[PDB]
Design an enzyme around this catalytic site. Structure first.
Site: not given
Lengths: 245, 245
Positions: B11, B13, B90, B92, B162, B168, B208
């Site tokens: 990912n 981003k 989603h 997030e 997730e 993070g 993570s």
């Protein structure tokens, strides 16, 4: 000057340091600004940045803007969440992957329709600049945008001239370059829709603005403030706001 | 045994080093992988990210995914550009600004309709976890997604569990936590569409994940691979792929 209300916009796209942000907004919250100016912070939802900003930001002259809107659901979601400004980084989307001038025009018209203030970023590439095609390119973009707007909609519109070659490169437009592009943009709005509207429109400059160069840029007749990336993640942003007096 | 083909998804981003990316894909291109696994890289269009990836990425087990799709134009644009996978964060969007479960469901159904493979990210907030509402929350999200799907559409769907509190933050779900959530997800799919489909569905863990912790997570019966942010911008991502054997 009969300049309209200037704007100072902090573009926080993809920032890395989140403790750094909270401290920044603390500084902003306590910053006394002695003139009329609209300040904007445009955090990403990425990490907590936008949510935290919504939570901590209290300065009366600041509003929160979002990075891009698509479909009216996303817009409605934003309204629900309390955000009512949008930044559309067309200059970049066009440059990096060829986003269409009509797409950004549709975006603008839609965002405005949902009652957002919209900061529309337009500008030419390095290529286009060297070629001498700035005016053609910039005029094309503003023209596309105007096509989708009624006269009254301009009250909800802000234009940022943001030449791609100046973005995060350290290469700032000279005052004359910015002034020409802004004049050019305004003249098209005057022609298309009226000198009254054209007069009220803020046109911000974007691309490698910092606290050293801001003041001289703002002195230009057709510069109404700034879109700031790198220098907006530093206490320096405060100098930029004050350069708008 | 009989896990379906695992997936290892990077990912990317909002990444903030472009030269770093090119080098990463060079490493990936030359990485020999000794088992069946679908790798995915999800670069942003931001900067040259996506365009460069499209250009340089050659490894046969890798595909390129986009970050979010809205309206069928954006989707069609993506198809045109050669991208046929989408990641929908989603978990997030819901957490940070309250994106609706039905919105993500519509997105999934639409992306699938345009013939994309879709990685749908669902999960609970720290709040919801502490409250003991994980199951309720996660089940609600999968339920919403399922309502918009026909049985055959699941072939085009991948779920990522997730939990937002693990994104993070360095706080990884324990194997038991991931296993529970995945099992819970799969058991809903089994009930409301069939054991056969439920058996084929990949459910990836995200939040993570790193080279040290991946292997033990993958050992769990209901874990079919990983959605990786930070560790996917490091040579470490290779260890993660190999943890999927």
């Amino acid at each position: 000057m009969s300049k309209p209300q200037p704007i100072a916009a902090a573009n926080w796209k993809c920032n890395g340091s989140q403790q750094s942000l909270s401290e920044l907004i603390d500084l902003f919250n306590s910053t006394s600004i002695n003139h009329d100016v609209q300040c904007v912070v445009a955090p990403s939802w990425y990490m907590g940045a936008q949510a935290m900003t919504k939570e901590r930001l209290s300065h009366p002259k600041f509003v929160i803007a979002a990075q891009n809107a698509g479909n009216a659901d996303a817009l409605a979601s934003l309204k629900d969440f309390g955000i009512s400004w949008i930044v559309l980084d067309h200059s970049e989307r066009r440059a990096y992957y060829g986003e269409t001038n009509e797409i950004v025009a549709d975006k603008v018209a839609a965002a405005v329709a949902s009652g957002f203030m919209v900061i529309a970023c337009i500008g030419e590439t390095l290529q286009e600049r060297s070629s001498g095609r700035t005016a053609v390119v910039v005029l094309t973009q503003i023209t596309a945008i105007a096509k989708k707007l009624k006269k009254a909609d301009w009250a909800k519109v802000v234009i940022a001239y943001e030449p791609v070659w100046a973005i995060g490169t350290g290469k700032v437009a000279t005052p004359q370059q910015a002034q020409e592009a802004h004049a050019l943009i305004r003249s098209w709005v005057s022609s298309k829709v009226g000198a009254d509207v054209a007069g009220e429109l803020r046109i911000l400059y974007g691309g490698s603005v910092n606290g050293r160069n801001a003041r001289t840029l703002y002195q230009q007749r057709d510069v109404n403030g700034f879109l700031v990336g790198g220098a907006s993640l530093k206490p320096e942003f405060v100098d930029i706001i004050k350069a708008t007096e």
